[PDB]
Amino acid sequence: SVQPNFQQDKFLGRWFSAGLASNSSWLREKAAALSMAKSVVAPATDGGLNLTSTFLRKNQCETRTMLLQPAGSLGSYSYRSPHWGSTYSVSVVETDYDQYALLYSQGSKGPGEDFRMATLYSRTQTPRAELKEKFTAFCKAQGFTEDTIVFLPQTDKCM
Secondary structure (H helix, E strand, C coil), X not given: CCCCCCCXXXXXXXXXXXXXXXXXHHHHHHHHXXXXXXXXXXXXXXXXXXXXXXXXXXXXXXXXEEEEEECCCCCEEEEEECCCCEEEEEEEEEECCCCEEEEEEEEEECHHHHCEEEEEEECCCCCCHHHHHHHHHHHHHCCCCHHHEEECCECCCCC
16 A cells, blocks of 8 residues: 555655546546646655645646645555545555655545545656556556546646
8 A cells, every 4th residue: 555665754855746547527627727837745743744736727826735644654644625524545655766656545534535546746847658657557457547547737837
């Protein structure tokens, strides 16, 4: 479930949100109309992570921050969303720290319990073929179909 021997300090820093797969068509569609700028992973006071995402929305730069509280094994987190009335499990399932990370999220409480999402984070804004295939292979193994896998538009604005 989690990356074996996960070391949080090496997962810190700048990542690019390069791909996502979800069983929510709404989320996929909304995300694709955004243009992703950098994400930043920083240490949180609670021992977990602050995940800060920057993106273009209708030509405006927007930033959103999510607190990833430590959940179970190292590399697993919980995200509580008052708006969605739900809590989500967020796990770093595989990473080499210096090129890519694969994240998997699903609801653990509330109406969001059926929500599922896989995320490709890349240290480079354009991940090479090997990294894209690691992501698609993971998505397929997890039951995401081809048309639910989205490579996300990027932008060099907002930074």
